[PDB]
Amino acid sequence: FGGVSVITPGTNTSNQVAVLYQDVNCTEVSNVFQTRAGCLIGAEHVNNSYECDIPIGAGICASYQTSQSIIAYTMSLGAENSCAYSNNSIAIPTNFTISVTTEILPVSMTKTSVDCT
Amino acid sequence: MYICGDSTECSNLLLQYGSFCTQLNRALTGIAVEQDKNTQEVFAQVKQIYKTPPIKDFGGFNFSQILPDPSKPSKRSPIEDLLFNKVTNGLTVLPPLLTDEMIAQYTSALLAGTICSGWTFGAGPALQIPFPMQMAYRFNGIGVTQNVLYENQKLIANQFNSAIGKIQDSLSSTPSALGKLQDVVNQNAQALNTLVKQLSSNFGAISSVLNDILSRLDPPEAEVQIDRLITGRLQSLQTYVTQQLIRAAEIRASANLAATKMSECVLGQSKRVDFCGKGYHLMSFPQSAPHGVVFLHVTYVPAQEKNFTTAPAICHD
Amino acid sequence: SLSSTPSALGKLQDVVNQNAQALNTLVKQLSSNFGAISSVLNDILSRLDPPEAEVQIDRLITGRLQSLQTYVTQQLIRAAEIRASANLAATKMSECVLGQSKRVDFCGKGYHLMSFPQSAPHGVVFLHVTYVPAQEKNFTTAPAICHDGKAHFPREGVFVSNGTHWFVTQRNFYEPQIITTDNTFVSGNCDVVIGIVNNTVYDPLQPE
Ligand SMILES: *[C@@H]1O[C@H](CO)[C@@H](O)[C@H](O)[C@H]1NC(C)=O
Numbered sequence A: 001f002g003g004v005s006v007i008t009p010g011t012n013t014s015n016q017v018a019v020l021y022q023d024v025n026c027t028e029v030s031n032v033f034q035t036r037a038g039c040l041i042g043a044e045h046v047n048n049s050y051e052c053d054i055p056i057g058a059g060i061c062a063s064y065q066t067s068q069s070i071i072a073y074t075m076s077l078g079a080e081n082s083c084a085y086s087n088n089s090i091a092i093p094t095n096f097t098i099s100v101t102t103e104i105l106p107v108s109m110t111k112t113s114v115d116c117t
Numbered sequence B: 001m002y003i004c005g006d007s008t009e010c011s012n013l014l015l016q017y018g019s020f021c022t023q024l025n026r027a028l029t030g031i032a033v034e035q036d037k038n039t040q041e042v043f044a045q046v047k048q049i050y051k052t053p054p055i056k057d058f059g060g061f062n063f064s065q066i067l068p069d070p071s072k073p074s075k076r077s078p079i080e081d082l083l084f085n086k087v088t089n090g091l092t093v094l095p096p097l098l099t100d101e102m103i104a105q106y107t108s109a110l111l112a113g114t115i116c117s118g119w120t121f122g123a124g125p126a127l128q129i130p131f132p133m134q135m136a137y138r139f140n141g142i143g144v145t146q147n148v149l150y151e152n153q154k155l156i157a158n159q160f161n162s163a164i165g166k167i168q169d170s171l172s173s174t175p176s177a178l179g180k181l182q183d184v185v186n187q188n189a190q191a192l193n194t195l196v197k198q199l200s201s202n203f204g205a206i207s208s209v210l211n212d213i214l215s216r217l218d219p220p221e222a223e224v225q226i227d228r229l230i231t232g233r234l235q236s237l238q239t240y241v242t243q244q245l246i247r248a249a250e251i252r253a254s255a256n257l258a259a260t261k262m263s264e265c266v267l268g269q270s271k272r273v274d275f276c277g278k279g280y281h282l283m284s285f286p287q288s289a290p291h292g293v294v295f296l297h298v299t300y301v302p303a304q305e306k307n308f309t310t311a312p313a314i315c316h317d
Numbered sequence C: 001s002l003s004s005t006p007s008a009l010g011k012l013q014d015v016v017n018q019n020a021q022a023l024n025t026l027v028k029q030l031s032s033n034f035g036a037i038s039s040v041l042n043d044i045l046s047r048l049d050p051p052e053a054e055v056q057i058d059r060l061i062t063g064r065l066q067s068l069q070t071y072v073t074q075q076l077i078r079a080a081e082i083r084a085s086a087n088l089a090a091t092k093m094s095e096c097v098l099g100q101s102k103r104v105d106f107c108g109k110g111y112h113l114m115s116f117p118q119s120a121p122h123g124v125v126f127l128h129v130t131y132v133p134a135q136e137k138n139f140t141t142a143p144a145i146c147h148d149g150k151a152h153f154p155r156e157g158v159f160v161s162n163g164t165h166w167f168v169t170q171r172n173f174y175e176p177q178i179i180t181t182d183n184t185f186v187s188g189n190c191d192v193v194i195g196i197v198n199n200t201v202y203d204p205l206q207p208e
């Protein structure tokens, strides 16, 4: 009795969709991918990891990629970097920049009143 | 399905009520989304993954109990392994977006960055620094000179390694050490066991089983008994969702506090008293735990004192 | 960035949309029967004899009251969420607009310099100005320098080497200076510090 979810690139991108059966095995329900989050039909699974676009669950995300189709993948967590630990060397800035960022917070709710009668 | 499972007549009566099921489904969807936002905000604070260095002895400091153990199927630290081992109708449970392995990977990246870059990697590019010098800066941050750390470097490293071993023994020894997470799990388990148990009540109906009402009574009476069951189940779902919204708000507040502690103490040295452990804060290390985060707070605490006579100033010339 | 990316302001739009949906839902509930012969009170009163109408009206009363209590409860919870957000915004206003915060990532990524408030519909937007390192170089270092048998430590800085000479710099910006008795302090001998490097320390008084 699991739910059915529709995964779409969006109306203004493509009319192709993938359908996720949240807990139904693909044997009970052609680009049919069984995941820990359910049976995903219509997305093509690839080995390459990408930044998460449309989340599915359990580490699996989907996106619309190049001919064009919906691709299912295990999400990338971040860029790689070299820790480069050394016991005799330090990295020190030689130049700097000034960065300005934006933080947006709600402060108030629309004030309403409802007469019970 | 909860109110009118496998019953066309009940569903048809349920459609006479307003959009209660839509509101309940939206509330639960919103909660699930918030839970994934909470996980990302607490753990996905740094979008660059740092590798574990090839060694554990950084200036004499042994980090083998906090860094992932590559020899085990689960790429978890001994402490994370212990933390995971200690914590254990129309109802569907959705998986998290970030798996336990992904959370462990974020924790590992944070530990690698802290060990080789100190707080620098959390406020700009990562800049490599020798660990004893990172500690020297952390000691200066609490009003202690660099000579104290360097002259006592072996003593400090030994105290640190012993303290970590004590953490592993303390967590193993006390069943209640992780009580907060078990309490969250138990409260949600009770909420669902209660919600399921509500289906067995009559609520004044001729029978608690919808199929008995349908098979025993003609529609002119069956609709009345069904309406009684609909009222009982709908009230039970509204109560459940309301309690879930309140608990979700509590969890959100906890996640916000955890994210604040992560960014202020793991990615920096905090001067806020008792914000990150008792004593003068030196550094913190995150560890993943089921449905939560464990912070190891490393602090400087005075150990021995002597009484001296003092004066506000010296008079000379 | 704000002009070209409308999703940037999603946090405020969602609050507006959530309250709009709640009000529309509250209105929509008036069209439901809740088991009554009609959603309109006047149709029940005109179609049924008083004692029958009383039952149908009481059923509609129960349905509408349940819907109104549901609305109020979700408004109380959402209001609590807004209160928490407003308290965070006030904290940031007091600590970053009216001061220089030392809390990491409290007011922007990088080291905090300043912030500026801006008014927004049903909220506040903070522009956080931070100092961010842009370029870096790797230098050889040492915890202390050994000179005349004593150990020299920086007073406010780090000792660096450029491959042939030792200099002392500030920690957050490369600015090499000659290592002197004014830039460093002396504590202990050359035997205790691990990794001490032999180097000259300049005494400004010796030439004069
Ligand atoms: C530092 O970076 C800025 C970037 O705006 C650049 O204009 C400037 O020339 C750089 N200066 C040095 C000394 O690297």
Ligand SMILES: *[C@@H]1O[C@H](CO)[C@@H](O)[C@H](O)[C@H]1NC(C)=O
Binding pocket: B056, B057, B062, B063, B064, B065, B165
């Ligand atoms: C670190 O400690 C563990 C035991 O806690 C030990 O097995 C390991 O050899 C130690 N490593 C170093 C480098 O001291």
Ligand SMILES: *[C@@H]1O[C@H](CO)[C@@H](O)[C@H](O)[C@H]1NC(C)=O
Binding pocket: C162, C163, C164, C165
């Ligand atoms: C280090 O700096 C000094 C002073 O500028 C200079 O004389 C020397 O050649 C430099 N050495 C290297 C290896 O760059």
